[PDB]
């Protein structure tokens, strides 16, 4: 076990398409799947999970290759990875649609499942990352404030295993810089919390898998150009940070091109890591959006 499991939850494994996925699950009721992003694992949801579990069955998987999940056997593009997550969720909700909450590259790895299987998704919450499309080619490499928030896209996508070679042995140092530089509320990331995430990402196959998601990003863009010919029809909510490190208004503005029914919120003073930086306001918004009318 890489992270403490909340009381009332089980840490378990399930083979999907030949790949052994790790997840933490608890609660009773309709299914909500929470999908973490880069630099983290299922554990980023550990404050939201006990709350949602009062009314829902909550499952939080580790993305393939990350946390305690095996790497994918097909590949790291969004459409390939979405298969695993879709099948995992259906094993627990084969007869009813489920809700989906995703953060950061959790968005990349679920959008294809959502758009191709809309009857399976009841409500959708996306936070703090772009859906892979040509808009990401407009983000600046360098800014009047110095170090940009997106230069890691190219570092991670670089060939010759550049990122593995430079970061191996310095995973803790790189991850602290990465996380804090994308945060407004930097203090929430304790020395011990950073050590836990670094321990997980320093596993050789997790270090490589991290970067393979970015190496597959251009293929994800090409996939999504075709997939986005169909708009999303289910109720959708976007969340973005309004502070340093966040997406700001981009998140909702992009989502309006993909979804018919979308409400968006920007959390002021919050950066990229909403579940940890702004837990109480974010948790309330998610629980509210998923509970209303039921």
């Amino acid at each position, epitope marked *: 076990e890489e992270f403490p499991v909340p009381n009332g939850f089980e840490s378990a494994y399930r083979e999907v398409d030949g790949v052994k996925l790790h997840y933490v699950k608890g609660g009773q009721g309709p299914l909500v799947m929470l999908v973490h992003g880069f630099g983290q694992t299922w554990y980023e949801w550990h404050q939201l999970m006990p709350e949602l579990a009062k009314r829902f069955t909550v499952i939080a998987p580790d993305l393939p290759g990350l946390g305690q999940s095996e790497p994918p056997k097909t590949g790291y593009s969004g459409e390939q990875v979405a298969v695993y997550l879709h099948k995992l969720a259906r094993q627990f909700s084969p007869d009813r649609p489920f809700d989906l909450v995703a953060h950061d590259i959790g968005i990349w790895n679920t959008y294809p499942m959502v758009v191709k299987n809309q009857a399976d998704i009841a409500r959708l919450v996306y936070m703090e990352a772009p859906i892979p499309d040509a808009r990401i080619y407009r983000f600046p490499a360098f800014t009047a404030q110095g170090e940009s928030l*997106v230069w890691h896209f190219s570092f991670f996508a670089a060939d010759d295993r550049l990122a593995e070679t430079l970061i191996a042995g310095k995973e803790r140092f790189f991850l602290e810089h990465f996380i804090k530089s994308h945060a*407004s*509320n930097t203090e929430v990331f304790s020395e011990r919390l950073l050590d836990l995430y670094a321990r997980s990402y320093a596993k050789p196959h997790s270090l490589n898998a991290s970067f393979e998601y970015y190496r597959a990003l251009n293929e994800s863009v090409r996939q999504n150009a075709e997939l986005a010919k169909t708009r999303l029809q289910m109720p959708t909510m976007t969340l973005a940070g*309004g*502070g*340093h*490190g*966040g997406m700001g208004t981009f998140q909702l503005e992009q989502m309006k091109a993909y979804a018919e029914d979308v409400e968006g919120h920007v959390l002021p003073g919050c950066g990229h890591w909403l579940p940890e930086e702004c837990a109480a306001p974010m948790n309330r918004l998610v629980i509210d959006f998923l509970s209303r009318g039921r």
Partner: nanobody
Amino acid sequence: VQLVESGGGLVQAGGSLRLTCAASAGSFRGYAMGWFRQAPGKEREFVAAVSVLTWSGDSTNIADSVKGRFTIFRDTAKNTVYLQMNSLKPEDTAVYYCNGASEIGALQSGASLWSWGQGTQVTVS
């Protein structure tokens, strides 16, 4: 948030100054920041504003009264904000203040989030 301005002084016309805005308590890392000024006799007026850094970049707005002479920028390692004042004129004489808002547009409209600090006096002789 407790705001502290510094860097003011007595300077000659055509000279230059750089003002610093810092937080002695709290943090304005999560917020857009702006500079304001007020002379004894006049109203307090917006001078310049800079956004937070997002994935798409950032944005600034410079009041027409100082456009081409003053610039604003942030240091995201120090969590400070600066006002670089070039080509100083006597009518730039005033107390200079910093404050924050959720976006630069609110600052442009004179709105701000926190109690004003003491400001820093700029006198151009």
